[PDB]
Design an enzyme around this catalytic site. Structure first.
Site, PDB file in Angstrom:
ATOM      1  N   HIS A   1      49.880 -20.638 -47.104  1.00  0.00           N
ATOM      2  CA  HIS A   1      49.853 -20.921 -45.645  1.00  0.00           C
ATOM      3  C   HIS A   1      48.709 -20.241 -44.941  1.00  0.00           C
ATOM      4  O   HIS A   1      48.223 -20.842 -43.967  1.00  0.00           O
ATOM      5  CB  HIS A   1      51.150 -20.720 -44.865  1.00  0.00           C
ATOM      6  CG  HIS A   1      51.986 -19.581 -45.325  1.00  0.00           C
ATOM      7  ND1 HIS A   1      51.928 -18.325 -44.762  1.00  0.00           N
ATOM      8  CD2 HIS A   1      52.903 -19.509 -46.322  1.00  0.00           C
ATOM      9  CE1 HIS A   1      52.793 -17.534 -45.378  1.00  0.00           C
ATOM     10  NE2 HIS A   1      53.394 -18.228 -46.329  1.00  0.00           N
TER      11      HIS A   1
ATOM     12  N   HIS B   1      45.871 -11.160 -41.595  1.00  0.00           N
ATOM     13  CA  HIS B   1      45.658 -12.595 -41.937  1.00  0.00           C
ATOM     14  C   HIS B   1      45.193 -13.279 -40.627  1.00  0.00           C
ATOM     15  O   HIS B   1      45.182 -12.661 -39.549  1.00  0.00           O
ATOM     16  CB  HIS B   1      46.898 -13.267 -42.454  1.00  0.00           C
ATOM     17  CG  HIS B   1      48.030 -13.229 -41.452  1.00  0.00           C
ATOM     18  ND1 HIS B   1      48.902 -12.161 -41.396  1.00  0.00           N
ATOM     19  CD2 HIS B   1      48.312 -14.030 -40.400  1.00  0.00           C
ATOM     20  CE1 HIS B   1      49.700 -12.326 -40.353  1.00  0.00           C
ATOM     21  NE2 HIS B   1      49.373 -13.476 -39.734  1.00  0.00           N
TER      22      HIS B   1
ATOM     23  N   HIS C   1      45.129 -17.210 -38.304  1.00  0.00           N
ATOM     24  CA  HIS C   1      45.581 -18.592 -38.071  1.00  0.00           C
ATOM     25  C   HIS C   1      44.371 -19.305 -37.444  1.00  0.00           C
ATOM     26  O   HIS C   1      43.652 -18.691 -36.596  1.00  0.00           O
ATOM     27  CB  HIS C   1      46.761 -18.663 -37.076  1.00  0.00           C
ATOM     28  CG  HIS C   1      47.892 -17.773 -37.470  1.00  0.00           C
ATOM     29  ND1 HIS C   1      48.977 -18.315 -38.113  1.00  0.00           N
ATOM     30  CD2 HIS C   1      48.109 -16.438 -37.354  1.00  0.00           C
ATOM     31  CE1 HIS C   1      49.887 -17.314 -38.286  1.00  0.00           C
ATOM     32  NE2 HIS C   1      49.352 -16.162 -37.933  1.00  0.00           N
TER      33      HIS C   1
ATOM     34  N   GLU D   1      47.343 -18.850 -31.924  1.00  0.00           N
ATOM     35  CA  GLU D   1      48.850 -18.989 -31.718  1.00  0.00           C
ATOM     36  C   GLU D   1      49.160 -18.593 -30.271  1.00  0.00           C
ATOM     37  O   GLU D   1      49.704 -19.364 -29.497  1.00  0.00           O
ATOM     38  CB  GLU D   1      49.534 -18.027 -32.705  1.00  0.00           C
ATOM     39  CG  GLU D   1      49.302 -18.550 -34.118  1.00  0.00           C
ATOM     40  CD  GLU D   1      50.416 -18.182 -35.031  1.00  0.00           C
ATOM     41  OE1 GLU D   1      50.731 -16.983 -35.179  1.00  0.00           O
ATOM     42  OE2 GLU D   1      50.940 -19.125 -35.665  1.00  0.00           O
TER      43      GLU D   1
ATOM     44  N   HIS E   1      45.762 -11.401 -37.014  1.00  0.00           N
ATOM     45  CA  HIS E   1      46.969 -10.574 -36.893  1.00  0.00           C
ATOM     46  C   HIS E   1      46.872  -9.423 -37.895  1.00  0.00           C
ATOM     47  O   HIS E   1      46.857  -9.664 -39.143  1.00  0.00           O
ATOM     48  CB  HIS E   1      48.214 -11.455 -37.235  1.00  0.00           C
ATOM     49  CG  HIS E   1      48.484 -12.437 -36.161  1.00  0.00           C
ATOM     50  ND1 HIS E   1      49.241 -13.558 -36.363  1.00  0.00           N
ATOM     51  CD2 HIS E   1      48.033 -12.444 -34.868  1.00  0.00           C
ATOM     52  CE1 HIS E   1      49.274 -14.244 -35.252  1.00  0.00           C
ATOM     53  NE2 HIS E   1      48.593 -13.576 -34.308  1.00  0.00           N
TER      54      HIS E   1
ATOM     55  N   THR F   1      55.686 -15.167 -36.466  1.00  0.00           N
ATOM     56  CA  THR F   1      55.366 -16.553 -36.054  1.00  0.00           C
ATOM     57  C   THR F   1      55.425 -17.524 -37.199  1.00  0.00           C
ATOM     58  O   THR F   1      55.163 -18.720 -36.981  1.00  0.00           O
ATOM     59  CB  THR F   1      53.943 -16.651 -35.451  1.00  0.00           C
ATOM     60  OG1 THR F   1      52.946 -16.422 -36.461  1.00  0.00           O
ATOM     61  CG2 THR F   1      53.737 -15.657 -34.310  1.00  0.00           C
TER      62      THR F   1
HETATM   63  N1  03T Z   1      52.072 -14.311 -38.073  1.00  0.00           N
HETATM   64  S1  03T Z   1      52.832 -12.892 -38.032  1.00  0.00           S
HETATM   65  O1  03T Z   1      53.873 -12.915 -37.043  1.00  0.00           O
HETATM   66  O2  03T Z   1      51.868 -11.771 -37.946  1.00  0.00           O
HETATM   67  C1  03T Z   1      53.592 -12.714 -39.546  1.00  0.00           C
HETATM   68  C2  03T Z   1      53.661 -11.522 -40.361  1.00  0.00           C
HETATM   69  C3  03T Z   1      54.567 -11.811 -41.493  1.00  0.00           C
HETATM   70  C4  03T Z   1      54.824 -10.946 -42.551  1.00  0.00           C
HETATM   71  C5  03T Z   1      55.703 -11.336 -43.576  1.00  0.00           C
HETATM   72  C6  03T Z   1      56.251 -12.617 -43.561  1.00  0.00           C
HETATM   73  C7  03T Z   1      56.015 -13.492 -42.515  1.00  0.00           C
HETATM   74  C8  03T Z   1      55.133 -13.088 -41.499  1.00  0.00           C
HETATM   75  S2  03T Z   1      54.611 -14.072 -40.160  1.00  0.00           S
HETATM   76 ZN    ZN Z   2      50.131 -14.308 -38.056  1.00  0.00          ZN
END
Ligand code: 03T
Ligand code: ZN
Ligand code: 03T
Length: 257
Positions: free
Chosen positions: A61, A91, A93, A103, A116, A195
């Site tokens: 993803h 990571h 998006h 986001e 993030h 998210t």
């Molecule tokens: N996109 S986030 O809210 O930074 C995110 C961090 C995170 C870590 C482990 C599994 C799902 C997610 S989703």
């Molecule tokens: Zn994220």
């Protein structure tokens, strides 16, 4: 499994993760006029001097740059936070086009991408326990706009051709995440969630006001990654963002006037 396709994207996620329709979901639109300055907010403390990156992973993803979080070596504190939060990974998006990808939005503006930096509260011992707590995580969000290259990003872009497909990883040591920050640490903050599934409501969001500048060529290389595994029909990794969710009367607080 969930994803960002036509058939398994964000409007489907509630069927397996009912907290998708919860009271503290992320991301949100940041209405800059409605966010109140909070003079009791402290400067954010980002201490990444000893950060230890280990590996980069295409998880199907996005890609995660992972850090050694077995000691207090890269921590976030201060700001709206009580206590010490350890960096575990970062990571992004991003969009198929420069007009979309972030986001969070700001007065409904979408940026080309959003970084993030994920941290967990050391009082809960590890990340899996922290995500069960309402103050378990602090995620530092930074918008990216397309313009001049970000020189500190280029080592990440250079490695992406080695992790093109889902489940591929590569050694990724000695990467300094300080090279991804903007100059100012002015921020907005609010209580929210992961998210992506499992969409846990465990995050203090800290979203910086100042975007970083990346080049068109940098973000084009993000869009060459694949959601699929090796040997599978190519599905470009683009548009891996969840749209803004209802604020539900949460307050967004500004660190700056
Ligand atoms: N996109 S986030 O809210 O930074 C995110 C961090 C995170 C870590 C482990 C599994 C799902 C997610 S989703
Ligand atoms: Zn994220
Ligand atoms: N997005 S999800 O609710 O987790 C999901 C799982 C799943 C499996 C097969 C086809 C569509 C979807 S949608």
């Amino acid at each position: 499994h969930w994803g960002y396709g036509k058939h398994n994207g964000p409007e489907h996620w509630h069927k397996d993760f009912p907290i998708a329709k919860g009271e503290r979901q992320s991301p949100v639109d940041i209405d800059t006029h409605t966010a109140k300055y909070d003079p009791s907010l402290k400067p954010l403390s980002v201490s990444y001097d000893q950060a230890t990156s280990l590996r980069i992973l295409n998880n199907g993803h996005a890609f995660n740059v992972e850090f050694d979080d077995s000691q207090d070596k890269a921590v976030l504190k201060g700001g709206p936070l009580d206590g010490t939060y350890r960096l575990i990974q970062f990571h992004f998006h991003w969009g198929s086009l420069d007009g979309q990808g972030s986001e969070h939005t700001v007065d409904k503006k979408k940026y080309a991408a959003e970084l993030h930096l994920v941290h967990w509260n050391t009082k809960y011992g590890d990340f899996g326990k922290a995500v069960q707590q309402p103050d378990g995580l602090a995620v530092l969000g930074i918008f990216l706009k397309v313009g001049s290259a970000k020189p500190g990003l280029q080592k990440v872009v250079d490695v992406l051709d080695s992790i093109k497909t889902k489940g591929k990883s590569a050694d990724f040591t000695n990467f300094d995440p300080r090279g991804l920050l903007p100059e100012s640490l002015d921020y907005w903050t609010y209580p929210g969630s992961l998210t992506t599934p499992p969409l846990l409501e465990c995050v203090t969001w800290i979203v910086l006001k100042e975007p970083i500048s990346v080049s068109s060529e940098q973000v084009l290389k993000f869009r060459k990654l694949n959601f699929n595994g090796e040997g599978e029909p190519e599905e470009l990794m683009v548009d891996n963002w969840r749209p803004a969710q209802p604020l539900k009367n949460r307050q967004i607080k500004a660190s700056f006037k």
